[PDB]
Design a protein around this ligand. Structure first.
Ligand SMILES: CC(C)=CCC/C(C)=C/CC/C(C)=C/CC/C(C)=C/CC/C(C)=C\CC/C(C)=C/CC/C(C)=C/CC/C(C)=C\CC/C(C)=C/CC1=C(C)C(=O)c2ccccc2C1=O
Ligand code: SF4
Ligand code: SF4
Ligand code: SF4
Lengths: 118, 407, 121, 183, 395, 124, 191
């Protein structure tokens, strides 16, 4: 009827009576997926000991060389993690991190996780 | 002669050229006389940078090449790795089904981006927003499944980086329910729109002979009527078991390509329905522990990490488990030496991957025959002689993603 | 008289616009930069100062014919306004006169159209 | 401009406040996507979010009208001249947002082909991680740029701020010398 | 009788006509400052966004913020431009835009401080064509901005502006004729008064459609925003312009929108007469309410503009000009002839003969136009032959 | 008169390294050298706008604004701009150093004699 | 500008409609003449205006000045001989009076304006319109014919990109180091 060619109008008019769908960030931020690759986080055991053992596996796996890890010895006078090693220095260059998540899959202690904070 | 023709840059920084594509146009007033193409304004060194990383790590690189078709790039890479390893016949069924589902949802997403960018290029401003509403519908599923919105590293050699989250299947079922309707809303803007059709009907014409000569593939080739799709001819990743129609057109022009994309979206929705239908629980990674990605990601109160069961296994009990985790994560699998060219039907055409292994844990060569790079050989054919406004429509119809073009 | 309000509105507009351009040039930062002052060419270096041998000195338009026809048609259509406003005062005589004139214009238009004059743009 | 030649009293302060407000509320981007991050920038403009909310709906196609440059992608070597040309062809005041790891520092592509940070070719106002940064992160970075713009000096205050920032910058030890617990 | 009403127009004290000019200027400024924000928010809604909603309460200041920002921004004068014309073009665009709106009836006579004066800056015997002349002059700003910028994209934008004129000017001129024919005058006050019985939109529907299309063209608004065509020419003519000069171009475009929509209201929608639901209400057409009704109709046209932007691509300017010369001009001319014959017959008592003609004529037009649309052209198909490059077999 | 050299870098150690390669009097057959050190692009630009410099050394690796970008800017913005020397953090950066139009380019790490010879060539 | 000014004068001389139509039609006309200047003469060509005919410039200046002086002399003082205002005429409608005259006394001339229009159209079509023989090939046509425009240098090679030079006029470098003629368009004057 030539009306089909005008269907677009029906669209736009209709949408200007349905409510807008925009997420209200930052006053009302949207729900990011539970699995999202947010900022890396270093975790602790319930007693407070650092989970990281400084093995550099996370940094090993990083395709971007975005993790720098230096291990150091745990000792009775100063212990940061269970076992003989811990990550004394742990830097992430977030201007090189691509959020891939390979670090997480690499970590053998779950010391490294990805939060949903972004 | 000279004096009546100007030479202009559609240039990198131009709304229709995706920022990094340079069309040098010799125009007689406003008719395109010659259309030189300047490429490499997005060259990134990925093909070489790959060579200094392991397998299963180069994935993170390849998904960055053709950033609109991440799952297609990743599937091509991982299929090449599996073909080299000879593991193509051992991949779990569930991984293959998830791969088809993700590639087809990605096809919907990539075509939505193509249509949005084309429509806004041709003045159809609301095309951008409606196409991106539809695309965000799919990107939420991608975020849930992979934790990333683009450049996913979810598809990995021999399977997937992890299994679907429990809610994923319901999210994809919701997609299968709504994508028809939202796509129809988009179609109402363009499909029969008189100004849209006038803007693309007969524009950017390219003969089937032209497509063959330049090596064109994807919607451009199929707009010539040829039903050539790598998913039916030369099946891969189990497309043989899916019922779907190869979308084709007879217009051989921009509007034919547009309609092919709009219909390919529906065919993708149909394949996604089939995927959900044939998605039985099972492993997503090859059972050969010597190659399988050892990490088992699981969420917790402290965020996404290795599942505590895996930590217990490799740090308290299983010495061979620990060695395998350590070596497959750090050094990674080493692939037998050899060459293999494996192709997939990316939304923009035959995305090929030439993969060469020197027996090492890093790839020796990974060359992407990105379809966009070859399709851009058609700028001369589809722009020369037409109006510059029509050249914009043609270039949009090609749907060149410059990341894959320049790699 | 009766036009001096139009002149006041025009004066207001002209002062507004001239002061607007003056503000544009005067308010805000100003820093000389050869790159900034060069022609925009989507980021590519613009041609040498001597654009080229010949080059974009002359711009063909594909609708020169329609432009020429526009001249004559636009002028010829202004006869309708006095006829339109004087209608109901001129009588059937003027109606027939303008019908004949408009048929002559139609013949011109049809000759132009059916012979492809309107096609090349 | 004359607006900066006002005396350093209340006139100049209020003019600075209003100008910063306006420039933060009308921060038109340039239509200058490069890569993945360009797609995420379009997604940010898309309805699920609304960059237009922040007065930034008009992605200016011409550099002249654009006040902000979201690099949003990887600057290859062959693109650095073009990116710099576009930057220089915006009219001041202009700010640059290095969207993504590629734009900010080269990202994963530590290679010959990539410039390793647009900072090499253009001053960067704000760096934004991500690969790609999700649209919420882009809006966050843009709001941080809004905060930077509002607290912007002018005239004699601009000169004093440049002097103070220069003096402060001369003292920071370089990143390579911030050896902490690193043995 | 002989509009302009000599008992109403041309007798303002100097201060009162100054104040009316000032009020019209401020009204146009606020109307443009509104239209900016309202258009952005309405486009957002049509695209399910919120549009600007932060700068100031409810995003009110966003248009004002953009204006002040452009003011506070560096004044560019590129080398390679014709400096004089490069600086004049915004002025040539702006002055006529404001001038045109002078003869727009925003209301009926009102007794301001005893003085009986119209809610209208002034009126002219040829007011409608005066608006047309002002708008035509305004296009010189666009074209000379394109040309004087000395860059390929502005040059193309200015040439598209010239083509835009070649497309819309004659169609607009012809669309005015039917209204003049039923009104018997070219003054806007006379044209509104002649619409007391009924609005010419119902009577002169073909003329209304032609005028509205030629209007959307005249302002360079989508789907005919060809001189800019950001998707093709980056910024078209207003490339190379920044700060208040670009702001002046855009303000000129929006004031042209307001002027031509106000004219559309004036000569097709009873001008300032209250719509039907308030037609029966006492005093709806007196006092200041006519101003409200005029603004309401003008803003319905503004909504039409925004809606067109949100739901149509942009034609190629050759396609638009082919529309103008193959659809708009023939239709307007044949409508003028048909309406003239219709009025002559009604004045000669033929009665039904006119109704048979009128209804038939459009019925014929609606066919032949579709003939140029689908039934005779623009709906064909063809094939092609292969070359020597060993092409595959098409199933 | 003394020559004034603008050494631009936000890394203090690179500035000290440049000041070491170039003594108070490089090539004793040459005038004395005066050093104005700048660690921000705006200050470097303003000092250049003041003028009177015989050479400017711009660390191509400067963090918030690279010395190559500043080099192109200063050549586009200061009439009678003094010759520019660039320190490049990468061998592949040479091409950009060519684009920056700096009269010479010295790769990191600053080789003292190479930098001194480059400067003497520019200031002669 | 001159046409606009004369329109203003027409309005000031109690000729509203004539002045307004002047503005409108001559806006159109000067727009088209500007288009034809861009086509046939040039976009910003600065013509020499140097006398090419020996002494012609002085002769033309003298003749023009003499004719102007003589016409002014002939006009002389005329208005002092009786200047009947136009009010009695414009009363009832300036346009109404013009309609009365045009379609009553000057009807024949009004009809002949149609002949003028038709002759202009016929001249335009005969001398300007170019029939099929010179019709430019369509993009559709161009892509065809041994796959034109793509078989041949698929898409001609782009102009070279160098440090310090990326403009379209820059020719690309072949492996041996020579400059590829094809990279730079035919119309450009090398570099
Ligand atoms: C006591 C009392 C009551 C006192 C009242 C005093 C008072 C307030 C005075 C009122 C009268 C006034 C204002 C007189 C002062 C003198 C005066 C008029 C100065 C003018 C100065 C000047 C030329 C400029 C400064 C700013 C200014 C206020 C100018 C006039 C108003 C406006 C709105 C002008 C320019 C702004 C404008 C119209 C356009 C800006 C450009 C654009 C592109 C607008 C925004 C925009 C548009 C339009 C899109 O198309 C779009 C499409 C899709 C996505 C996004 C966008 C988008 O962002
Ligand atoms: S975060 Fe995990 S992988 Fe990285 S050093 Fe610590 S324990 Fe090892
Ligand atoms: S997210 Fe990827 S790139 Fe970032 S630190 Fe982890 S492994 Fe490295
Ligand atoms: S930073 Fe990551 S997402 Fe952004 S353009 Fe580079 S590769 Fe793509």
């Amino acid at each position: 009827k030539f009306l089909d060619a005008l269907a677009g109008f029906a669209v736009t008019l209709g949408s200007m009576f349905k409510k807008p769908i925009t997420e209200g960030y930052p006053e009302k931020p949207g729900p990011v997926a539970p699995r999202y690759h947010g900022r890396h986080q270093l975790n602790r055991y319930p007693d407070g000991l650092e989970k990281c053992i400084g093995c550099e596996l996370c940094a090993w796996a990083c395709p971007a060389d975005a993790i720098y890890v230096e291990g150091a010895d745990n000792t009775a006078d100063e212990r940061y993690s269970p076992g003989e090693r811990y990550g004394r220095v742990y830097q992430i260059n977030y201007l090189r991190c691509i959020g891939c998540g390979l670090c997480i899959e690499a970590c053998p202690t779950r010391a490294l996780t990805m939060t949903t904070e972004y | 002669q000279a004096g009546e023709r100007i030479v202009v840059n559609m240039g990198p920084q131009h709304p229709s050229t995706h920022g990094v594509l340079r069309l040098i146009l010799e125009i007689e007033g406003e008719i395109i006389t010659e259309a030189r193409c300047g490429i490499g304004y997005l060259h990134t060194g990925i093909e070489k940078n790959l060579e200094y990383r392991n397998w299963t790590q180069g994935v993170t690189f390849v998904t960055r090449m053709d950033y609109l078709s991440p799952f297609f790039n990743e599937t091509a890479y991982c299929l090449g790795v599996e073909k080299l390893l000879g593991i193509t016949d051992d991949i779990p069924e569930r991984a293959s089904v998830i791969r088809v589902m993700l590639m087809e949802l990605n096809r919907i997403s990539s075509h939505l981006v193509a249509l949005a960018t084309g429509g806004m290029e041709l003045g159809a401003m609301s095309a951008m927003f409606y196409g991106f509403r539809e695309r965000e519908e799919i990107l939420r599923v991608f975020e849930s499944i992979t934790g990333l919105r683009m450049n996913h590293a979810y598809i990995r050699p021999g399977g997937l980086a992890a299994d679907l989250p429990d809610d994923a299947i319901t999210q994809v079922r919701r997609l299968v329910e709504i994508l028809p309707k939202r796509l129809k809303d988009l179609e109402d803007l363009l499909n029969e729109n008189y100004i849209w059709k006038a803007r693309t009907v007969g524009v950017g014409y390219l003969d089937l002979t032209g497509c063959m000569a330049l090596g064109i593939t994807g919607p451009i080739l199929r707009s010539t009527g040829l039903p050539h799709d790598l998913r039916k001819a030369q099946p891969y990743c189990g497309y043989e078991n899916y019922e779907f129609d190869v979308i084709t057109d007879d217009r051989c022009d921009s509007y034919g390509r547009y309609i092919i994309r709009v219909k390919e979206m529906h065919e993708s929705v149909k394949i996604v329905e089939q995927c959900l239908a044939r998605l039985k629980p099972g492993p997503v990674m090859i059972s050969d522990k010597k190659l399988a990605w050892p990490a088992d990601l699981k969420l917790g109160p402290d965020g996404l990490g290795n599942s505590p069961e895996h930590i217990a296994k490799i740090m308290g009990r299983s010495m061979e488990g620990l060695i395998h985790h350590f070596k497959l994560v750090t050094e990674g699998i080493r692939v037998p030496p050899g060459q293999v060219y494996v192709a997939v039907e990316s939304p923009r055409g035959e995305l090929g991957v030439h993969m060469v292994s020197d027996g090492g844990t890093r790839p020796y060569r990974v060359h992407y025959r990105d379809p966009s790079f070859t399709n851009l050989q058609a700028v001369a054919a589809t722009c020369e002689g037409g109006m510059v406004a029509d050249a914009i429509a043609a270039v949009a119809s090609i749907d060149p993603v410059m990341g894959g073009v320049d790699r | 008289a009766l036009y001096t309000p139009i002149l006041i509105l025009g004066a207001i507009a002209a002062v507004f616009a001239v002061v607007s351009v003056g503000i544009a040039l005067v308010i805000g930062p100003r820093r000389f930069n050869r790159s900034k002052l060069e022609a925009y060419e989507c980021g590519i270096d613009p041609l040498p100062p001597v654009a080229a041998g010949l080059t974009g000195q002359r711009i063909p338009i594909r609708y020169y014919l329609i432009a020429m026809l526009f001249i004559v048609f636009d002028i010829e259509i202004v006869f309708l306004y006095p006829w339109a406003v004087a209608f109901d005062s001129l009588g059937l005589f003027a109606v027939i006169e303008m019908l004949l004139f408009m048929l002559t214009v139609f013949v011109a238009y049809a000759y132009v159209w059916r012979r492809g004059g309107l096609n090349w743009d | 401009g004359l607006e900066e030649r006002l005396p350093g009293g209340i006139l100049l302060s209020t003019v600075e406040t209003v100008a910063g407000y306006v420039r933060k509320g009308s921060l038109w981007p340039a239509t200058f996507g490069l890569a993945c991050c360009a797609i995420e920038m379009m997604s940010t403009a898309g309805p699920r979010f609304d960059i237009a909310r922040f007065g930034m709906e008009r992605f200016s196609a011409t550099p002249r009208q654009a006040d902000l440059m979201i690099v949003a992608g990887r600057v290859s070597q062959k693109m650095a001249p073009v990116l710099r040309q576009i930057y220089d062809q915006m009219v001041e005041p202009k700010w640059v947002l290095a969207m993504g790891v590629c734009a900010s520092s080269g990202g994963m592509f530590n290679n010959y082909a990539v410039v390793q940070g647009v900072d090499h070719v253009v001053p960067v106002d704000i760096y934004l991680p991500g690969c790609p940064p999700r649209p919420e992160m882009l809006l966050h970075a843009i709001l941080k740029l809004h905060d930077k713009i509002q607290q912007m000096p002018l005239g004699v205050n601009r000169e004093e701020a440049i002097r103070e920032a220069e003096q402060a910058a001369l003292a920071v030890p370089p990143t390579i010398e911030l050896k902490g617990l690193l043995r | 009788m002989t509009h302009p009403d000599p008992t109403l127009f041309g007798h303002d004290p100097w201060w009162l006509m100054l104040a009316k000019a000032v009020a019209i200027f401020v009204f146009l400024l606020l109307t443009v400052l509104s239209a900016i924000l309202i258009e952005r928010k309405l486009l957002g809604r049509m695209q399910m966004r919120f549009g600007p909603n932060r700068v100031g309460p409810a995003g009110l200041l966003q248009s004002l913020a953009d204006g002040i920002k452009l003011a506070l921004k560096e004044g560019l004068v590129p080398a390679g431009v014709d400096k004089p014309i490069y600086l004049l073009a915004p002025v040539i665009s702006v002055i006529p835009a404001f001038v045109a709106f002078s003869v727009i009836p925003l209301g009926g006579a009102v007794s301001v401080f005893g003085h009986r004066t119209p809610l209208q800056l002034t009126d002219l015997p040829v007011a409608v064509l005066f608006i047309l002349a002002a708008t035509s002059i305004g296009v010189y700003g666009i074209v000379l901005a394109g040309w004087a910028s000395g860059s390929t994209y502005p040059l193309l934008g200015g040439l598209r502006s010239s083509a835009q004129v070649v497309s819309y000017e004659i169609a607009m001129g012809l669309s005015f004729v039917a209204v003049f024919l039923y009104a018997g005058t070219m003054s806007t006050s006379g044209i509104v008064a002649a619409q007391d019985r009924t609005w010419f939109v119902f009577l002169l529907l073909p003329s209304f459609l032609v005028y509205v299309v030629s209007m959307v063209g005249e302002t360079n608004r989508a789907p005919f925003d060809l001189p800019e065509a950001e998707g093709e020419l980056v910024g078209g003519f207003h490339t190379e312009y920044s700060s208040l000069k670009f702001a002046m171009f855009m303000l000129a475009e929006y004031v042209n929108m307001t002027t031509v929509s106000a004219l559309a209201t004036t000569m097709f929608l009873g001008g300032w007469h209250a719509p039907f639901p308030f037609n029966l209400i006492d005093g709806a057409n007196s006092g200041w309410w006519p101003l409200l009704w005029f603004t309401a109709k003008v803003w319905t046209f503004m909504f039409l503009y925004f809606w067109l932007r949100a739901t149509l691509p942009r034609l190629r300017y050759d396609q638009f000009m082919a529309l103008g010369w193959k659809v708009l001009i023939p239709v307007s001319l044949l409508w003028i002839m048909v309406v003239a014959i219709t009025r002559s017959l009604r004045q000669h008592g033929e009665g039904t003969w006119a109704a048979w003609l009128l209804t038939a004529a459009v019925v014929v037009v609606v066919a032949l136009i579709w003939g140029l649309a689908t039934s005779l052209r623009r709906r064909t198909v063809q094939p092609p032959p292969p070359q020597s490059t060993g092409a595959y077999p098409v199933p | 008169a003394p020559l004034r050299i603008l050494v631009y870098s936000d890394n203090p150690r690179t500035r000290e390294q440049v000041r070491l390669a170039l003594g108070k009097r490089i090539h004793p057959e040459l005038p004395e050298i005066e050093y104005v050190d700048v660690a921000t692009a705006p200050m470097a630009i303003s000092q250049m706008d003041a003028g009177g410099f015989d050479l400017a050394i711009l660390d191509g690796e400067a963090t918030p604004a690279g010395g190559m970008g500043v080099a192109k800017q200063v050549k586009d913005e200061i009439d009678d701009c003094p010759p520019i020397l660039v320190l490049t953090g990468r061998a592949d950066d040479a091409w950009l150093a060519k684009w920056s139009r700096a009269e010479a380019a010295v790769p990191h790490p600053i080789d003292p004699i190479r930098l001194s010879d480059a400067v003497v060539s520019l200031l002669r | 500008c001159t046409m606009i000014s004369l329109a203003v004068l027409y309005i000031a001389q109690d000729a509203p409609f004539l002045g307004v139509v002047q503005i409108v039609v001559y806006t159109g006309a000067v727009m088209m003449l500007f288009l034809f200047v861009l086509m046939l003469i040039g976009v910003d060509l600065t013509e020499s205006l140097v006398e090419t005919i020996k002494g012609h410039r002085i002769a033309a200046l003298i003749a023009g000045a003499g004719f102007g002086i003589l016409v002014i002399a002939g006009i002389g003082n005329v208005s002092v001989a009786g200047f009947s205002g136009l009010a009695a005429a414009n009363s009832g409608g300036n346009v109404e009076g013009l309609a009365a005259l045009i379609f009553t006394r000057y009807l024949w001339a009004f009809e002949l304006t149609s002949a003028l229009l038709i002759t202009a159209a016929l001249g335009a079509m005969v001398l300007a319109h170019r029939e099929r023989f010179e019709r430019r090939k369509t993009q559709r046509e161009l892509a065809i014919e041994r796959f034109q425009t793509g078989g041949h240098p698929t898409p001609l090679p782009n102009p070279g990109v160098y440090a310090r030079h990326n403009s379209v006029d820059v020719p690309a470098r072949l492996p041996d180091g020579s400059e590829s003629p094809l990279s730079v368009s035919t119309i450009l004057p090398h570099r």
